[PDB]
Amino acid sequence: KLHKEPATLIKAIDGDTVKLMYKGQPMTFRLLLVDTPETKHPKKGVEKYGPEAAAFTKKMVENAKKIEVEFDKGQRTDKYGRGLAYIYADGKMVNEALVRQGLAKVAYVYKPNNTHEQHLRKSEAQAKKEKLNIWS
């Protein structure tokens, strides 16, 4: 069973990345299963809807009382050292909130880190139907 653990915000970095204090250590976290347009893209730079996704993530974590992280059942870090997790702001998953708003797509999935995949894909289908942001 997945479990939520507490964490403390340090800094929001981009739509898809936040730095948190986790078990008393600063760590960078990549949000599992979503791809946001980025402000810090390796090659493109500032993509379309990137500032918007970045502001949404930032506001959501900065205004939270409680941040929780939930790892999935497979690897917990990626090749850059970033934690791979679902992030919750007052009980609300940030990963899902971004997809539901049309500010992220469901990413290419890699088993077994796929526990909330069907849920996110359902939110994404709804955002596409509503033609929100990325889908407008």
UniProtKB/Swiss-Prot annotation:
Top-level division of the source organism's lineage: Bacteria
Region (Disordered): 116-136
Cell location: Secreted
Residues that coordinate or bind Ca(2+): 16, 35-36
Biased composition (Basic and acidic residues): 116-132
Residues of the active site: 30, 38, 82
The protein's name in its UniProt record: Nuclease A
Lineage: Bacteria, Bacillati, Bacillota, Bacilli, Bacillales
Gene name in the database record: nuc
Residues of the full protein shown: 88 to 223 of 231
